Amino acid sequence: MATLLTTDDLRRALVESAGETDGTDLSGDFLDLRFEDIGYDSLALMETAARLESRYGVSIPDDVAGRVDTPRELLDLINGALAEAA
Numbered sequence: 001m002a003t004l005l006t007t008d009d010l011r012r013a014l015v016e017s018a019g020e021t022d023g024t025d026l027s028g029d030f031l032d033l034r035f036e037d038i039g040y041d042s043l044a045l046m047e048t049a050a051r052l053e054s055r056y057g058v059s060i061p062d063d064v065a066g067r068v069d070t071p072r073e074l075l076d077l078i079n080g081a082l083a084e085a086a
C-alpha cells in the first residue's frame, strides 16, 4: 500500500498552507524551486508535511521537515517513506 501524492497533490496542498489561494504557480516541474525563495517557513513545511502524514500514512519527524529546501525533497519524504515502510 503506497498511494503516492503527485505533483498536483503537493501543489494544491502547498498552496493551501499559504492560507489564501494566491496562486504561487507550482505546476509542471517546480521541484527545482526553493521554499526559501518562495517565502516558505520551515514551520509551514512541517505543517504541509503534517497534512500529508495523516492523509497518506506517513510520519515525518519535526526536524526532518525543516531540512527540506526544495519541494522535491518534501515530496520525496512522503513518496519515499511509503515506498520504504508503509
Ligand SMILES: *P(=O)(O)OCC(C)(C)[C@H](O)C(=O)NCCC(=O)NCCS
Pocket: 036, 040, 041, 042, 043, 066
Ligand atoms: P526554515 O528553517 O527555512 O524556516 C526558517 C523560518 C522561516 C522559520 C525563520 O527562522 C523565521 O521565520 N524566523 C523568524 C524569527 C523567529 O524567532 N521565529 C520563531 C519561529 S517559532
